[PDB]
RNA sequence: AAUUGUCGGGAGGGAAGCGGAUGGGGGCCGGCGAUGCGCCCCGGUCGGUGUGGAACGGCGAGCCGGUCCGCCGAUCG
RNA sequence: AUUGUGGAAGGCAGCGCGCGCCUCCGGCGUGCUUCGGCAUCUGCGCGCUCCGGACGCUGGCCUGUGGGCUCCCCAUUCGA
RNA sequence: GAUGAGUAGGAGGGCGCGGCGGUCGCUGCAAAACCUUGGGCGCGAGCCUGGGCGGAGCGGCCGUCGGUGCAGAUCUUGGUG
C-alpha cells in the first residue's frame, strides 16, 4: 504494498521471514528469497515479491501437470485474499508459453520479467513431466 | 486491434530515436574528420622525415666546409637529454631524493626526457651518482615512445595505442599524432613542456648485458653521469 | 621499490554515503545520485554531498 | 534535462606489428616501400 | 577483365606501388569520364518457437579474426626425398616421400616390398629429410587422399593391390641407383660417438 | 545438470596454514594464529620458516567457493528449501544437512531428481 | 587429552621436529568421466478457426486480453 | 622458450577485386616533381590482412594394473 | 589507472561462544558431545559434509545483550609422564 515499493525494499532488504542466508556475511555468503511470487528466488529489488506491486507467480497447481499463472492485481494491494489473478493452465508448453508472454510482456505488466517467467515456466513444466514418469536422462552431457 | 501502447512507452521510444539520430550523426561527422586527419598526419610525418635527413646532411656539410677553410665548426649544444636512474631507493639523502622526484625518477631504471638549460643541468649535477644520461638520437626517441610510450590522461597511465589518446590531451597544442609527439620532443619545440609532461616516465627493463659498475662515474669506467651519445647504446639494451 | 608515500594511495577520508539508517534519507540519496550523474549539474553534486553530512554539519537555519 | 545515456586494448608493439604501426603513422608504409625499392635497385646495380 | 594482380607485394602487406600510382592503374580516371565526371555510387547489398527457455543467459564467444593457414612443408622435404621416421612402430626405417596431403601430413611409402612400410601418413614433426632423392615421376598417387586412411582386423585385398601398383613403378627407379635398395631396407640408428647435431642427412 | 562455470579453478595454495610450533606442543592447536612475539622468526618471515596467510593468496573471484564438480554448495534441511534452487540448478548444488533423518533424506533426494538439482551427499545414511 | 600396553605399516652411523619440491608405497574419491542432441516414418497417446457460457484481468464510461468448459469448422501439432 | 586473461563489438587501420579500356611481371588521363616519384585526383559496393586478448585438428582413456588427490607413512635435493 | 615492509600504536571489515526479543527449521527412521588415514570450502579466524560412537535434545537467520575466545603469569585445581 500500500506504500511505494521502493520504500518497502528499504525495510525488508535487511530482514524478512522469506530471506534465506547461509555461510555468514563474508565472501562465502549466499542469499536467496523464497516468497512464492519471486521467479528466480533472488533477494533483489527486481525480483522481490514484497516490494513490487506487479509480480509474477508460476508454480505447480494441484494435480494433472497443471501450472498456475498468477499476477498481483494493481487495485487490490490491500486485499490479500483477492490480490492474485490466478489462471490454471493445463495445455501444451507452447500454449502456456504464449499465455505467459501475453500476461507479462504484451500488456506491459512486467516486461523486465519476461525472460525469468518463461524460464520459470520451463523449469516448472519440466519437473511436472519427470514427476509423472520419473528421471530418464542425467542431463550431464555438454 | 492489438494492445494499446501506453504513453510512457511512446515517450521513451520517441526520445531513443532522437538520441540515436544525434549519436548516428557523430560517426558521419567524426568519420569525415578522421579521414582529413589521416591526410594531415601523413603529410606532417612526410615533412618531419625530410627535415631529419636534411639536418643530418646539413651538419656534415658544415663540418666539411670548416675543414676546407682550415677552421673549426662547433656543433650546436645538445638541447635534449634522456636520464635513467641506476641506483635504488635505499639510503637516500634528502636533497637527492627531492631532485629525483622533480625529475619523475621514482624507480630504478625509470627514464625521462629533460630539456637542457642552466636550471635543469645544475639540478642534474647534484644527482650525478644516481643517474646516467646523454643525448638521445632519433632512433632512441622513436623506440621509447612507440614501444614504451604511455600518456598521462586525467592522472592515469594510458598506453599510446591510438592517436586519439595523444589528441585528447595535446590536441590544443597542435599535437594530434604520435609523429607530432616525436617531433616536439626531438626538436624541443615551443610545447615541449606539455608534450614531455604528458609522457609517463618510461618503465625500462634491466639492461641486457648488465652494467659495468654503478658505483663509479662513466668516465672512470663506471655507469653514472653523462655518457653523451653513448646513452643510445644503453637505450637499445634497456628498451 | 617505488619512491611514493603510502604506495601512492590517498590518506584523506570523506563521507561517500550517509551514516544514518533513515530509509527516507537513503531514498533521497538514491534520487540525487541519479540527478548528479545524469545531469552534471553543480547544484545536484553539492546537494548530494550535503546529504551525507552529520548532524553538526547540517546546522539549523532560523 | 538528463543527458543521453552512455575495455582495455591489448597494447601491441608497432616496431614489430605492421598494421599497428600504420594505424599510428600512416606514412610508415611509404617509408617502408621506398627503403625496400631503394635496396632492390642497389642490389641489382652491383 | 584484368589478368594479373595490379600491385605486387614487396613484403607481406606492402604493395609495390603507391596510392597515386594505383589510381592511374585502377583506371578510376577513365571510369570518372564514362560516368559524367563522377565515380558511380552503388547501394549496400540488401524462427520455430523454443521448446525450452534457459534460466541463465547464454554467452557467445567474441569474434576472432585469425584464420588457420595450411601446414607448411619443410624446404628439405621434396617429392622423392628419403625420410627417416623418428617415432612409432616404424621408428628408424627409411621411406620415400610422395606428396603432402590436404591435412598437412606427408604421404610416404616404404616401399612395402623393401622394408614393409605401406602407404602411410607421417607427421612432418616426426621425420628427418635426407639429401637422397629417388625419382617418383612415374608414381601416380592422385587417387590417394586423407579419406583413403580414414577408419570406419583384416586388411582388404583392395588396398594390397593398390600398394603394389604404386610400389611397382617405384621399384624400377630404386633399382637404378646402386646400393639404394639395401639403403632403404636398413633402419637408421645411432652408434657410439655419433652426434645427431653433427650428422649430415 | 551441466555446470555453468567454464573457467578453470586455479588454487594458489592447496596446503593449509598450520600454526607455528603446533607440532611441538600438544596444547598448541593447528588452527592459525598470528605470532605476536618480538623475536618470532615466523612473524619476521625468515626463509625456511612457516608461512603466514595474506591477501595475496586470494583465489580468483570468478572461481571462488566452487566445488570440484563445478557448482556452489547450498545446505538444505527439507524439501521446501530444496525448491529454492530450481532456477539455479546450473550454478548451485544442494547438500543435505548432517542432522536430517534418513526418512526425510529420501524425500529430498527424490524431489531433487525431479528438479534436476545436484545433491553432493545423496548416498548418506541410506544403508 | 596427557600417559600406557598390544597388533599392524614404516624409519633410524652423536637429536627429533619444521618450510618448500617431487617421487615411492598406502588410503580415499564414480557430480572420479559423457553417452545426449537434431532431423525423418511406424504405431500409440494427448490437445487443436469461428461462434456460445463460467470465473477474472491490463489500461483508465470505454477499449484491450488471457485462463477454463462446451459446440462447429479446420484437420495440424 | 613462457603464455590465451576477455566473451557485448566484423569497429579502427592498411589494402585487394568490381564500377572504363589494353598486347596483362606491364601499358593508357590531369596536377606536382629533386624526373626516382607523389595521400594530386584515391568515391561507392563486395572482400582480404601482422587489424578492439586462441583457435583448429588428431589420438589416448572412460569401472581398468585407469585417472585424480589438498589425506597418510617414508625417501631424497634445497631451506631451517 | 596506480599501488602492496612494518614493532609500539590506531581503525575497519569479518570468524567463534552463551543468553534474550523475533523468525525459519531439524530430531528415537537417532539431537548434543565426542572419535576418524573419509571428502570439500575459505588468504584466514572458521565452515559444510561422509562414517563411527552416543541415546535426548539442537540449529540457521535478523536484532540485541555478556562473567564471550589462552601456550606462557616460579599462573589456579585436577590428572599424567
Ligand atoms: K597404539
Ligand atoms: K607461441
Ligand atoms: K579416463
Ligand atoms: K625433506
Ligand atoms: K531460534
Ligand atoms: K568430520
Ligand atoms: K546472538
Ligand atoms: Mg647502500
Ligand atoms: Mg615501474
Ligand atoms: Mg644472457
Ligand atoms: Mg657487477
Ligand atoms: Mg656507497
Ligand atoms: Mg611493488
Ligand atoms: Mg606504509
Ligand atoms: Mg585451502
Ligand atoms: Mg627485535
Ligand atoms: Mg554425523
Ligand atoms: Mg590418547
Ligand atoms: Mg579466454
Ligand atoms: Mg602493509
Ligand atoms: Mg550458539
Ligand atoms: Mg590421529
Ligand atoms: Mg553457527
Ligand atoms: Mg552469564
Ligand atoms: Mg573472563
Ligand atoms: Mg592451558
Ligand atoms: Mg602469550
Ligand atoms: Mg607451572
Ligand atoms: Mg600441579
Ligand atoms: Mg612422577
Short mmCIF file of N, CA, C and O (backbone and C1' of nucleotides) in Angstrom, two decimals, chain F residues 1 3 13 15 23 26 49-51 69 71 118, chain G residues 1-3 17-21 30-33:
data_model
loop_
_atom_site.label_atom_id
_atom_site.label_comp_id
_atom_site.label_asym_id
_atom_site.label_seq_id
_atom_site.Cartn_x
_atom_site.Cartn_y
_atom_site.Cartn_z
N UNK F 1 22.47 -32.10 -14.76
CA UNK F 1 22.73 -30.66 -14.81
C UNK F 1 24.14 -30.40 -15.32
O UNK F 1 25.10 -31.05 -14.89
N UNK F 3 27.17 -27.82 -15.39
CA UNK F 3 27.61 -26.62 -14.67
C UNK F 3 27.84 -25.45 -15.62
O UNK F 3 28.34 -25.61 -16.73
N UNK F 13 47.31 -21.96 -3.42
CA UNK F 13 47.93 -22.82 -2.42
C UNK F 13 46.91 -23.85 -1.96
O UNK F 13 45.76 -23.50 -1.68
N UNK F 15 48.01 -26.46 0.32
CA UNK F 15 48.39 -26.76 1.70
C UNK F 15 47.74 -25.77 2.66
O UNK F 15 47.49 -24.61 2.32
N UNK F 23 53.18 -28.59 16.05
CA UNK F 23 53.77 -29.93 16.09
C UNK F 23 54.45 -30.20 17.42
O UNK F 23 54.29 -31.29 18.00
N UNK F 26 51.37 -30.31 22.19
CA UNK F 26 50.02 -30.83 22.01
C UNK F 26 48.98 -29.76 22.31
O UNK F 26 47.97 -29.65 21.62
N UNK F 49 60.94 -20.98 7.14
CA UNK F 49 60.05 -20.98 8.28
C UNK F 49 58.61 -21.15 7.82
O UNK F 49 58.31 -21.13 6.62
N UNK F 50 57.72 -21.32 8.80
CA UNK F 50 56.30 -21.43 8.50
C UNK F 50 55.82 -20.17 7.79
O UNK F 50 56.26 -19.05 8.10
N UNK F 51 54.92 -20.34 6.83
CA UNK F 51 54.38 -19.23 6.06
C UNK F 51 53.12 -18.69 6.72
O UNK F 51 52.35 -19.43 7.33
N UNK F 69 33.20 -30.29 -8.54
CA UNK F 69 32.20 -30.68 -9.53
C UNK F 69 31.75 -29.52 -10.41
O UNK F 69 31.08 -29.76 -11.41
N UNK F 71 30.03 -26.66 -9.16
CA UNK F 71 28.88 -25.98 -8.59
C UNK F 71 29.26 -25.35 -7.26
O UNK F 71 30.32 -25.63 -6.69
N UNK F 118 21.58 -31.03 -8.28
CA UNK F 118 22.66 -31.91 -7.86
C UNK F 118 22.70 -32.00 -6.34
O UNK F 118 22.60 -30.99 -5.63
P A G 1 41.38 -38.86 23.35
"O5'" A G 1 42.47 -37.85 23.91
"C5'" A G 1 42.73 -36.62 23.25
"C4'" A G 1 43.60 -35.72 24.10
"C3'" A G 1 44.81 -36.38 24.73
"O3'" A G 1 45.89 -36.51 23.83
"C1'" A G 1 43.67 -35.10 26.36
P A G 2 46.90 -37.75 23.96
"O5'" A G 2 47.84 -37.35 25.18
"C5'" A G 2 48.60 -36.15 25.16
"C4'" A G 2 49.08 -35.77 26.54
"C3'" A G 2 49.99 -36.78 27.22
"O3'" A G 2 51.34 -36.65 26.80
"C1'" A G 2 48.31 -36.07 28.73
P U G 3 52.03 -37.80 25.91
"O5'" U G 3 52.10 -39.06 26.89
"C5'" U G 3 52.75 -38.97 28.15
"C4'" U G 3 52.27 -40.04 29.09
"C3'" U G 3 52.33 -41.47 28.58
"O3'" U G 3 53.61 -42.04 28.66
"C1'" U G 3 50.21 -41.08 29.52
P G G 17 61.96 -36.44 12.36
"O5'" G G 17 61.06 -35.17 12.73
"C5'" G G 17 59.92 -35.31 13.56
"C4'" G G 17 59.46 -33.98 14.10
"C3'" G G 17 59.09 -32.93 13.06
"O3'" G G 17 57.76 -33.08 12.60
"C1'" G G 17 60.52 -31.97 14.68
P C G 18 57.39 -32.80 11.06
"O5'" C G 18 57.66 -31.24 10.87
"C5'" C G 18 56.96 -30.28 11.64
"C4'" C G 18 57.44 -28.88 11.34
"C3'" C G 18 57.46 -28.50 9.87
"O3'" C G 18 56.20 -28.07 9.40
"C1'" C G 18 59.53 -27.94 10.86
P G G 19 55.82 -28.19 7.84
"O5'" G G 19 56.65 -27.03 7.15
"C5'" G G 19 56.31 -25.67 7.34
"C4'" G G 19 57.03 -24.78 6.36
"C3'" G G 19 56.91 -25.18 4.89
"O3'" G G 19 55.71 -24.73 4.29
"C1'" G G 19 59.17 -24.79 5.41
P G G 20 54.98 -25.62 3.17
"O5'" G G 20 55.97 -25.56 1.92
"C5'" G G 20 56.30 -24.32 1.31
"C4'" G G 20 57.43 -24.47 0.32
"C3'" G G 20 57.24 -25.54 -0.74
"O3'" G G 20 56.43 -25.12 -1.82
"C1'" G G 20 59.39 -25.74 0.21
P A G 21 55.54 -26.19 -2.64
"O5'" A G 21 56.62 -27.13 -3.33
"C5'" A G 21 57.53 -26.62 -4.29
"C4'" A G 21 58.34 -27.71 -4.94
"C3'" A G 21 57.59 -28.97 -5.31
"O3'" A G 21 56.85 -28.83 -6.51
"C1'" A G 21 59.65 -29.53 -4.27
P G G 30 32.46 -41.45 -4.28
"O5'" G G 30 32.27 -41.18 -5.83
"C5'" G G 30 31.11 -41.62 -6.52
"C4'" G G 30 31.12 -41.20 -7.97
"C3'" G G 30 29.98 -41.76 -8.82
"O3'" G G 30 29.62 -40.82 -9.82
"C1'" G G 30 32.05 -42.51 -9.68
P G G 31 28.37 -39.83 -9.59
"O5'" G G 31 29.04 -38.42 -9.30
"C5'" G G 31 30.23 -38.02 -9.97
"C4'" G G 31 30.53 -36.56 -9.74
"C3'" G G 31 30.42 -36.10 -8.29
"O3'" G G 31 31.39 -35.08 -8.03
"C1'" G G 31 28.88 -34.89 -9.63
P C G 32 32.85 -35.49 -7.50
"O5'" C G 32 33.23 -36.76 -8.39
"C5'" C G 32 34.40 -37.52 -8.12
"C4'" C G 32 35.32 -37.56 -9.31
"C3'" C G 32 34.65 -37.86 -10.65
"O3'" C G 32 35.33 -37.16 -11.69
"C1'" C G 32 36.25 -39.53 -10.19
P G G 33 34.56 -36.07 -12.59
"O5'" G G 33 34.10 -36.88 -13.87
"C5'" G G 33 33.36 -36.26 -14.91
"C4'" G G 33 32.90 -37.25 -15.95
"C3'" G G 33 32.17 -38.47 -15.40
"O3'" G G 33 31.17 -38.89 -16.33
"C1'" G G 33 34.07 -39.18 -16.58
#
